[PDB]
Amino acid sequence: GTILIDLSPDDKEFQSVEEEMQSTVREHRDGGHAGGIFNRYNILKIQKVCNKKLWERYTHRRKEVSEENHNHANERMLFHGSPFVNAIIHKGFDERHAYIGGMFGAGIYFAENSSKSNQYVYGIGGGTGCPVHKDRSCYICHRQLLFCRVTLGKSFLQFSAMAHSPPGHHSVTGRPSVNGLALAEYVIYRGEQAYPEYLITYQIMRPE
Ligand SMILES: Cc1ccc(C2=NC(=O)C3=CC=C[NH+](C)C3=C2)cc1
Ligand SMILES: [Zn+2]
C-alpha cells in the first residue's frame, strides 16, 4: 500500500523539513553515548510516505479527538527514531512500536529535538550502534528518522526531571524541568494518532 516519493532538494518542502531536522539538534547529557557526537547532519534523501489506508485511519482518529477537544486536534510535526522504521512506513504505528520501558509508560514516543530521536535509531540507548561497524557514533552508515504528523488532543503535562492515556487526556507531554536547552517529548497510546509522513535518510557529521 505504501509508496515513497523522493523530494528534490530544490523543493521548498524538502528545505523546510531539512531545516527542522538541522535546527533542532542539541547536546545530550550522555556526551554522545547513545546517538553519537555531532552538531549537524548530512541529509541524503527525504521521501514523502503515501499510504491512503493509513492516512484515512489517521484522519478518522484525528476527527474523533478534535470533537472531544473543542474542535482542536492539537496536531504537531514531531520526530520518531526506531529500529522498526521500515515496518512503520508499510504497516503504520501500533503496539509493537511502543517503548515499553519509557518513563511515561508503554506508549509511542516522539521528540521535538531530532537529535533525541537519533538516539533510538539503533535501539534503546543506541543499542550496539550501526549493524556494520557496531559504532553508536558511526559517521559512515546511513540512518533514518521519521518526521510525523501527531495528534495530541488534550495532553497531560508532566514536568520532568500498550498503556492508556491518563483519564480525560489523549497524550502525555514530557516537559523538561532541569535541562534548560531540551525541547519537549510526547507520548501517544494509540497508533492511529500518528502518520509517518516523511522518511529522512541521513548521516551524522563529525565536528571539525
Ligand atoms: C523500541 C523503541 C522505539 C522507539 C523509541 C523512541 N523513539 C523516539 O523517537 C523518542 C523520542 C523522544 C523520547 N523517546 C523516549 C523516544 C523513544 C524507543 C524504543
Ligand atoms: Zn557504521
Swiss-Prot record:
- Tissues expressed in: Highly expressed in placenta, skeletal muscle, liver, brain, kidney, heart, thymus, spinal cord, lung, peripheral blood leukocytes, pancreas, lymph nodes, spleen, prostate, testis, ovary, small intestine, colon, mammary gland, breast and breast carcinoma, and in common-type meningioma. Highly expressed in fetal liver, heart and brain.
PARP catalytic domain mapped to chain residues: 8-208
Entry's localization field: Cytoplasm; Golgi apparatus membrane; Nucleus; Chromosome, Telomere
Q: How is it modified after translation?
A: Ubiquitinated at 'Lys-48' and 'Lys-63' by RNF146 when auto-poly-ADP-ribosylated; this leads to degradation. Deubiquitinated by USP25; leading to stabilization.
Q: What superkingdom does the record give? A: Eukaryota
- Quaternary assembly: Oligomerizes and associates with TNKS. Interacts with the cytoplasmic domain of LNPEP/Otase in SLC2A4/GLUT4-vesicles. Binds to the N-terminus of Grb14 and TRF1 with its ankyrin repeat region. Interacts with HIF1AN. Interacts with RNF146; this interaction leads to ubiquitination and proteasomal degradation. Interacts with NUMA1.
Protein family: Belongs to the ARTD/PARP family.
Q: What does the function comment of this entry state?
A: Poly-ADP-ribosyltransferase involved in various processes such as Wnt signaling pathway, telomere length and vesicle trafficking. Acts as an activator of the Wnt signaling pathway by mediating poly-ADP-ribosylation of AXIN1 and AXIN2, 2 key components of the beta-catenin destruction complex: poly-ADP-ribosylated target proteins are recognized by RNF146, which mediates their ubiquitination and subsequent degradation. Also mediates poly-ADP-ribosylation of BLZF1 and CASC3, followed by recruitment of RNF146 and subsequent ubiquitination.
What is the name attached to this protein's record? Poly [ADP-ribose] polymerase tankyrase-2
